[PDB]
RNA sequence: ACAGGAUCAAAUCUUCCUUGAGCGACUCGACAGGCAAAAAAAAAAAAAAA
RNA sequence: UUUUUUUUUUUUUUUUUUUUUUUUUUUU
């Protein structure tokens, strides 16, 4: 419920075309989350699931 | 006469090729700023906008009762400035001893109106919550009832008759003492219960004559 | 700028020439402009948060002695060991306790340890190791402004004593927070004690024009000393203190006496510090009036060669950001697009210089030789033969005035002393031959230029080669030789011998090259007067053009031949190691000039030989030589004909500006 | 840092020193150099909690309203309140977000201090606090509150400290009724506590004993209502009283409970923050919506005796 | 900290691993402030310069 | 201008408000 009213339109049109819960398939392993998904998912369980980038570094001359 | 004087070059080449260096540095400093600005914002999310609101915060001073005070002062004036507007009528001059006659609704809804008659005895002058007392008797019963200057609900008011004098003006002003001798207190000379004989007083407030 | 550096060290063709280890100078820095600086005010708030709760007296930190080269003894026994100590030693064995002439006296008759050479019985030690002098001031710091001028100049009277760093230091900063109390005549005096103390004892540059003090007999067989820690290489003065002085100068200009701004602007030019709103207000200030007069022969020179030489790189390094300006700008996208839709040497003001002519020419004769080419060396720079301008009438005047301090010249009276004192005067000498030459080339190309659309100069230059030939002879014969590149186990190579080696062969290159022009400046003479143009551009350009000719000289071709005929002998025994690099081509080219309707120098001059050497240097050096220089060296050769398999393959082969086109 | 007599005599002649009024408009508009780019609009859960808000006590005012009823409402301030720093499960282990208020004097903040601020990239603070708040709700940092957080006529939590009086009596911190003044009574029985305890069947004072000591320094938590914001300088208006001094430090915060229940059911409220749309007006000034009835009615009731 | 390491090797902007949880978080290293004068309901208000 | 009820406001939170104490240191 919470996924489906943030995603934007695009994700929102594909989260419909499953053949059943997203939530379920990703918890069993049938499914691969996409990025944005992971986003919100994440949001809501206050925890970051993956190793998530680190935009710093200092250029070597 | 912004800064003492100085003895610089005024040949229009020279300003010309000093504004060149000038400009660099200008752009420079703006390039360096926007670099920063970005990294920071890259690396920790860093965000510094600019204000808002006018505090003194803003201003980099601290908080005092003194501008408390004149807050509070600003608001008052500004909520006079717009209650003044919303009335439909001019406040007339009147002071104590002046017959009145006030004009204000009592419900809204039933279209009820209410007209009262009577002479000033009291005029408190305020700022916000200034007020007029009027005294009056009906079949030889007497009534008072005060009535805020500034409010919505008066209809109308007017001055039947007016007793113009520099009487008036006397009570109208705000006297200032003749004399320090105030200070002297005399009620506050009395004598205990207990306390030793001095004379020949009696317990209590003491006389001035001897 | 960090794409500016990548590039740099990305780059395979740029190095750092030098010659030798004197040559190399402090980077050129260019100062800004004052402005009000709310927030350093507003940091200096924190800055002062507990003085309450500190020292009234010594709030600042103490200095620390220098540290010992090897580590101290084991059980620190020094007094037991009996051994004399330094007096940095001392002090810090002693707890850094002070050691008042009597204090010290009375110890030196009871122990050993305190009968050092820096243990003065009638000066004491200072709570820092000063010593000689130094220990019998107070600190600097301590000091009030009124009395900053007259410590500093007792202090100028008095790996051996390291504490002086200390009290120099002090000074130096003390200098910079007084600065806006001080009075303005006496902050000169202040920074110019202050760079006597950072530059005493040194050595100027081989290339270099400008120079603080002349080279004088100081009571080795040159009798020049070297020292890498006083190196010219050495900021004297730290950018700093100039930059903090710089707003005082700008308030109180008009308050300065010719003698105060002489100084000043030498100040300036030791430091290497720029200042264009300084430079800019000096100019404007300063003029001929029928007061530039005020200044004396001494002073006008000092403070026209400093302008010059600050100015010349203020315009050289106002060209560089140009150019590095270009980046910074954004450019949008539909900029780009319409783009590709369309793709389908006067640094001097007019009156200024006037005025420093006149001068020149109206005083003559009150000049000296070191002066006088100082000065005319500085502004014969502006002269140039590509062709605001100067005029005619200006070149004219200081024409007129070298030819009148040449009549005038006495040509040595000091004796012959030092060899380095008589190498600086032939160098000096050769300048105002340099100058001498630029003057009637810019005058001629000028005036023959002009008529198209529409003073015996000679007579006196003519002493000069003259005097140059017989003193290089001289100099060469009583300069001690040295081993040649072309033919304990350690050769003897002393460093003190080849400064005035190179600063010889500097005056010869000089002479060689103003030679060269002279014909130039001759052959311009009235084939049509453009032809004759375009020929001279030729010439200095390096093209193809038509063979040159000695005749046109006249009077000077026996001058010429007899320089021809020392530079000969010169290089034919010492190499041609010592030559400079931005005059190399010249040598050459007077060499071409040299074989024309030639008897016998054809055997001498081959076609170890002077040409062999030369051209040894030329190979060696191929690294760092100019476009130009290469053109017309590659003209040169052909000219006389030498062939050279070494010289032949760099010609052809290590250069794409010239063998990659025709 | 004056005398006495000079103090008394510059809190007279203050008045005298007052700046001009300012000049209030009508209608604000914000542009991108205002907005947070991080900052973006989250649909609220069930489980979803908001953060809170610090101000400053000015003074008491009376105002009136669209039916004519006057009433006493507290002026606030949030003197520039920005977020600091955010406190995770995975980093520290709890979720919160850490908000600064006030100004310092830069002669007065230790070094270790300005070292936070400089990283900041903010001027010193006077006062910094905490909130829990969800997950979901976690603003970015460098973001600077503002009064349209709370919208007019909801019901707030305020808290904040209460007032010192020093050393009271036992009659005047409880109010004890004490002894009559006359019939033959004793002086020390005027104002005496009276019987403290019970016989030798109880030999000990029970804890939390009704005594005298030290009165007010406590902390006091009330309900408010919104009845007037002001966007231009920053100002709040609350529906009845705050304790602390003209001054102090106040937490706001929303409904919680039966409050909640009650009242904050109906009324939609930016949940995360006010987010300005670029290119957009909006109001300087919001004011409570009347009610419905007449308040100014006075109804029949029957009084019938049986 | 992009600090270290592997690979026939990554969109601009690190594919993946190590740092026990990068010392609870930030920051400082001449850091920090007890007492005195003056002021002083809690609290706040003084840049240094005899 | 201050104090007070004789005036005004609330009657909500309790894993809340608040606080004197960072703890891999098993012989300071």
Known sequence: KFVRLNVSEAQRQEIKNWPGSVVRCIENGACIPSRELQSRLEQVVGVPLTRRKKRAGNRRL | ?210 | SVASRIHFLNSRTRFQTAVHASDVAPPFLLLPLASPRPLLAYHHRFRTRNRKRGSRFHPHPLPLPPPPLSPPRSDAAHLFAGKPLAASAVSTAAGQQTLPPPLLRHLQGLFPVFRGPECDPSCGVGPAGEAAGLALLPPPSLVEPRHLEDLARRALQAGACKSDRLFWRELAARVEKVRDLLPIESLVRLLTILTLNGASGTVRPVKQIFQAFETQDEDNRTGLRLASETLPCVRPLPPRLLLASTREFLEDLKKLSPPATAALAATFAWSNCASSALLFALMERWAWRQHLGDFTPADFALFVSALGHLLSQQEATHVKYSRQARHLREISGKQIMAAFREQKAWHFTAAFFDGCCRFMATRAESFSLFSFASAARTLVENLDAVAACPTPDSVEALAKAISLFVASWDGGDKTHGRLATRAANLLLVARLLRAASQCELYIHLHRALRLEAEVDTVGACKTLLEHISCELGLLHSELEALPLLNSRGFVHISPDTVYVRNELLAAAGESAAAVVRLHHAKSLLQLSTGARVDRVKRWMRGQQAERMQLETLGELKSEAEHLADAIDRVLRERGAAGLPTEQLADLMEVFALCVGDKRVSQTPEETLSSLQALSSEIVRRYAALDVNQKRRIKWATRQMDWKDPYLNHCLGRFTAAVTRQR | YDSRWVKRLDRLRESKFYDPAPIIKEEEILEADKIHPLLKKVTPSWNSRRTGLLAYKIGMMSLWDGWGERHAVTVCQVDRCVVMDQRTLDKDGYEACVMGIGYKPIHKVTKPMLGVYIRSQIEPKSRIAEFKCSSDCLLPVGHEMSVRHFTPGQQVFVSGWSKDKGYLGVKKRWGFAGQNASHGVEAKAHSSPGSIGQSKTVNVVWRFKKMAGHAGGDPRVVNCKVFRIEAQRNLIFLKGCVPGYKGSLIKISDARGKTHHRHNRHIPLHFPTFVPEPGVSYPVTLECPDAEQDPFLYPEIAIADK
């Open chain 2, 1 to 210: 006469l912004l800064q003492p004087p100085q003895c610089l070059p005024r040949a229009p080449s020279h300003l010309a090729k000093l504004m060149e260096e000038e400009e660099r540095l200008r752009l420079y400093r703006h390039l360096k700023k926007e670099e920063r600005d970005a990294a920071t914002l890259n690396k920790f999310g860093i965000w510094a906008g600019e204000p808002i609101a006018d505090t003194p915060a803003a201003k980099m001073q601290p908080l005092v009762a003194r501008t408390c005070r004149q807050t509070m002062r600003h608001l008052q004036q500004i909520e006079i400035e717009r209650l003044d507007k919303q009335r439909n009528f001019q406040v007339p001059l009147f002071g104590p001893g002046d017959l009145m006659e006030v004009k204000y609704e009592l419900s809204r809804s039933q279209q009820t109106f209410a007209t009262f008659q009577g002479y000033c005895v009291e005029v408190r002058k305020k700022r916000l919550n200034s007020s007029f007392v009027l005294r009056n008797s009906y079949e030889g019963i007497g009534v008072e009832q005060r009535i805020p200057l500034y409010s919505p609900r008066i209809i109308s008011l007017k001055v039947v008759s007016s007793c113009a004098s520099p009487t008036q003006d006397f009570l109208l002003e705000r006297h200032k003492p003749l004399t320090r001798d105030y200070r002297y207190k005399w009620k506050y000379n009395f004598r205990g219960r207990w306390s030793r004989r001095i004379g020949k007083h009696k317990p209590g407030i003491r006389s001035v004559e001897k």
